[PDB]
From Swiss-Prot, chain B:
CDD domains: RecA-like_CDC48_r1-like, RecA-like_CDC48_r2-like
Quaternary structure annotation from Swiss-Prot or TrEMBL: Component of the heterotrimeric CDC48-NPL4-UFD1 ATPase complex. The CDC48-NPL4-UFD1 ATPase complex interacts with the HRD1 ubiquitin ligase complex composed of the E3 ligase HRD1, its cofactors HRD3, USA1 and DER1, substrate recruiting factor YOS9 and CDC48-binding protein UBX2. Interaction between the complexes is mediated by interaction between CDC48-NPL4-UFD1 complex member CDC48 and HRD1 complex member UBX2. Forms a complex composed of CDC48, NPL4, UFD1, UFD2 and SHP1.
SMART domains, per the entry: AAA, CDC48_2, CDC48_N
Impact when changing residue 283 to A: Moderate reduction in growth rate
Gene3D superfamilies, A to Z: 1.10.8.60, 2.40.40.20, 3.10.330.10, 6.10.20.150, P-loop containing nucleotide triphosphate hydrolases
Role noted for this protein: ATP-dependent chaperone which probably uses the energy provided by ATP hydrolysis to generate mechanical force to unfold substrate proteins, disassemble protein complexes, and disaggregate protein aggregates. By recruiting and promoting the degradation of ubiquitinated proteins, plays a role in the ubiquitin fusion degradation (UFD) pathway. Has a role in the endoplasmic reticulum-associated degradation (ERAD) pathway which mediates the cytoplasmic elimination of misfolded proteins exported from the ER.
Record-listed ATP 2 binding positions: 499-504
Location within or outside the cell: Microsome; Endoplasmic reticulum; Cytoplasm
Domain of life: Eukaryota
Protein name: Cell division control protein 48
Gene: CDC48
Further facts: Present with 78400 molecules/cell in log phase SD medium.
Listed result of changing residue 283 to N: Severe reduction in growth rate
């Protein structure tokens, strides 16, 4: 029950899902504006 | 009476002691003169005296920092001496502590040079710790070096040096060089023996010259692994204060040939140079093991070199040698002769009080939860050496960490301190850790104390009186026997039905004379016969001698009557000197397989029959069992006692256990569907209906016939 407590990882907002990109950009990754709003992200800033 | 009581001081001055004029008058001290205050464990300091009539007579004023430096608590006693040889310092070197300078940068040495030593003339000493205020912090530094010796005073002309690097604080604490008597518990007897063996040659050698004797040198302490032998040796060495130079057996044995001899020679010579000194060894068996099993030349040369060094020790020199070994007989016998390791000391598994003290000492820093009942833990822990207790504490702390970790995330490199504030070990964590331990010392013959009295014995009054007369009287009344010349018998053998309360009688007898009980079950003798067991009966009797007075117990002695073990037992028992406080108590349910030689005079000659408990005895035993389990009010045990004709103590105990199990099962069912925290009549009715007898009547007839024949 608790002996495996260390193994599990607490959930947090910053972790995100992986999907194949429609575009071919490598250094450029696109996310919904809602994710940026929750994380307070804006344009012009590298991740 | 010059000792003065330590009193808490509101002021934080680190070199000023305010005392009443009567304090000076007692020692005839003069105003404006520094004084030396000495505490405990070779801790001392020099302070400037001031007159404070407000302080009551005998009350001093020393800041908490100085008391911490001296390693003393509030209300302790410290010796005060004058300082007629007051001197000023010429060159003093001090370095900072990194954790003390966190939050502020820069060099505070120049900042503190003038303000704190503007003709202050504060006395200084090696190792002193002093706190100065810089910026928004109070930074504490240590006195790394002072010249000229010994302590001197901080004058303005003194040259202050600060070239170096910071040194942690806890590193000094963990060095292990500073461990006093307060760090050991449960070894009062062994500690006293070691102190009387070591201090007198070193602290007061003149006594031996006055009485005209060569002081002893060879001390050898042995016991089960992880019993604190190294810790005890280190503590006593630090208490003495003499120079200490340790030698690790594994380390010495780990270097190529010739290097070991060089190391041993250098260590011995250096110790000789710095008398008084103490030489300690570890796993002396490893460097000088039994020769019959290791015939290599390397161990032979090493042990011969050690013997030569031991022999070459000069007559008058404050040097004492100590050794540690798990098996007393593993080491080469040549080291046990006169002029070598002879003062033998045995360390056994601590008793309930010893375990409580050890647990108290170890758990002095952890954040114990509100509910801690260390007494219960000590009671449950039977056969735990100190190391196992430390492991138990660590495992309980780990379990608490497991419980509290789910709140935090380990991916982040920082953990909120608010969580740390909530850390605390609960009783359930200790219970679980105790569940997940692995004691191993008890698995082999080790001397332990027992505290069973005659009350626990349900009857057999005549046997009690006879055994008392046989054993107890010569233990405390030797003069009578010497006057009449009668030698004391030792070999007492119990015979009778199994499970009739023999080991309990042996424990009671051992507790009567305050002797260390030793148990050797029959399977151990069988394993020794097969040679698988590491220990040998020679080891058992050697430990019994070293731990005298003792009561050795041989359970199921008929299991070996095998002839080799019988012969070895006969030889060891007969070779024993009768006047020694060593007794052997045998148990056996088949008094026929025993060889006649075992019954010869000077051996197991006393025969004692053990009868089945009488109705009164059965009632008393039943009362003894029912002490912690509550019973239905008005419960009557007379019917049970009368209905248990021919039963043994073990059978009645089993009846009680099954009745309690039925009660617990009924409680579980009721809870599922603690209204019944006790037992009622129905459970005892069930148990008695499920009664039986572990001994048939034919066996009783056989035992009665044997007893009558022995009587005739
Ligand atoms: N009073 C004590 N008695 C026994 N062990 C103690 C005591 N206090 C602390 N301990 C713990 O016991 C260990 C110290 O003893 P240690 O394990 O060195 O003994 P040892 O097995 O005799 O040593 P050696 O390595 O020299 O053969 C440490 O874990 C220490 O924390
Ligand atoms: N005078 C007595 N006679 C018989 N049994 C007793 C007596 N006093 C106590 N007992 C109980 O009997 C049990 C004896 O256990 P054990 O030592 O295995 O058997 P034995 O002593 O016959 O070798 C103990 O658990 C103890 O509670």
């Amino acid at each position: 029950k608790t002996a495996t407590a260390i193994l599990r990882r607490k959930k947090k907002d910053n972790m995100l899902l992986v999907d194949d990109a429609i575009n071919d950009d490598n250094s450029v990754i696109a996310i919904n504006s809602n994710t940026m709003d929750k994380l307070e992200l804006f344009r012009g800033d590298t991740v | 009476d010059n000792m003065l009581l330590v009193d808490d001081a509101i002021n934080d001055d680190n070199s000023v002691i305010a005392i009443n004029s009567n304090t000076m008058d007692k020692l005839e001290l003069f105003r404006g003169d520094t004084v030396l205050v000495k505490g405990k464990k070779r801790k001392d300091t020099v302070l400037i005296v001031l007159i404070d009539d407000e302080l009551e007579d005998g009350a001093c004023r020393i800041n908490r920092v100085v008391r911490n430096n001296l390693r003393i608590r509030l209300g302790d006693l410290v010796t005060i001496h004058p300082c007629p040889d007051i001197k000023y310092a010429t060159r003093i070197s001090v370095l900072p502590i990194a954790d003390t300078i966190e939050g502020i940068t820069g060099n505070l040495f120049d900042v503190f040079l003038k303000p704190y030593f503007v003709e202050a003339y504060r006395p200084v000493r090696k190792g002193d710790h002093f706190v100065v205020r810089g910026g928004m912090r109070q930074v504490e530094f240590k006195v790394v070096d002072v010249e000229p010796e010994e302590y001197a005073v901080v004058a303005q002309d003194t040259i202050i040096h600060w070239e170096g690097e910071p040194i942690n604080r806890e590193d000094e604490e963990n060095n292990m060089n500073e461990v006093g008597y307060d760090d050991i518990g449960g070894c009062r007897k062994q500690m006293a023996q070691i102190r009387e063996m070591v201090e007198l040659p070193l602290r007061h050698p003149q006594l031996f010259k006055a009485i005209g004797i060569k002081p002893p040198r060879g001390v050898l302490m042995y016991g089960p692994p992880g019993t604190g032998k190294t810790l005890m040796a280190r503590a006593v060495a630090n208490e003495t204060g003499a120079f200490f130079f340790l030698i690790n057996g594994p380390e010495v044995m780990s270097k190529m040939a010739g290097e070991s001899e060089s190391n041993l020679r250098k260590a011995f010579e250096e110790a000789e140079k710095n008398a008084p000194a103490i030489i300690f060894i570890d796993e002396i068996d490893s460097i000088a093991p039994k020769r019959d099993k290791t015939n290599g030349e390397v161990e032979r040369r090493v042990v011969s070199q050690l013997l030569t060094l031991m022999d070459g020790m000069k007559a008058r020199s404050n040097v004492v040698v100590i050794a540690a070994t798990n098996r007393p007989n593993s080491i080469d016998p040549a080291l046990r002769r006169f002029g070598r390791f002879d003062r033998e000391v045995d360390i056994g598994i601590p008793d309930a009080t010893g375990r409580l003290e050890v647990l108290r000492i170890h758990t002095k820093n952890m954040k114990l939860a509100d509910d801690v009942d260390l007494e219960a833990l000590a009671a449950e822990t039977h056969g735990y050496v100190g190391a196992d207790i430390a492991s138990l504490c660590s495992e309980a702390a780990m379990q608490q960490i497991r419980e509290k970790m789910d709140l935090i995330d380990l991916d982040e490199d920082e953990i909120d301190a608010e969580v740390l504030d909530s850390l605390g070990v609960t009783m359930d964590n200790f219970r679980f850790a105790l569940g997940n331990s692995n004691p191993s010392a008890l698995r082999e013959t080790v001397v332990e104390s027992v505290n069973v009295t005659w009350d626990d014995v349900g009857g057999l009054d005549e046997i009690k009186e006879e055994l008392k007369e046989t054993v107890e009287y010569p233990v405390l009344h030797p003069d009578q026997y010497t006057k009449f010349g009668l030698s004391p018998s030792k070999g007492v053998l119990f015979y009778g039905p199994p499970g009739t309360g023999k080991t309990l009688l042996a424990k009671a007898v051992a507790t009567e004379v305050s002797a260390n009980f030793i148990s050797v079950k029959g399977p151990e003798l069988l394993s020794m016969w097969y040679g698988e067991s590491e220990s040998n009966i020679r080891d058992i009797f050697d430990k019994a001698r070293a731990a005298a007075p003792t009561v050795v117990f041989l359970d199921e002695l008929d299991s070996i009557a095998s002839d080799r073990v019988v012969n070895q037992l006969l030889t060891e028992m007969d070779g024993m000197n009768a006047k020694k406080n060593v007794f052997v108590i045998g148990a056996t349910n088949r008094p026929d397989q025993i060889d006649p030689a075992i019954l010869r005079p000077g051996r197991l000659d006393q025969l004692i029959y053990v009868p089945l408990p009488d109705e009164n005895a059965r009632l008393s035993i039943l009362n003894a069992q029912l002490r912690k389990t509550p019973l239905e009010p008005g419960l009557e045990l007379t019917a049970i006692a009368k209905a248990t004709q021919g039963f043994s103590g073990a059978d009645l105990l089993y009846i009680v256990q099954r009745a309690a199990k039925y009660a617990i099962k009924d409680s579980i069912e009721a809870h599922r569907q603690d209204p019944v925290p006790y037992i009622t009549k129905e459970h005892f009715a069930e148990a008695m209906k499920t009664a039986k007898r572990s001994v048939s009547d034919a066996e009783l007839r056989r035992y009665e016939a044997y007893s009558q024949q022995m009587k005739a």
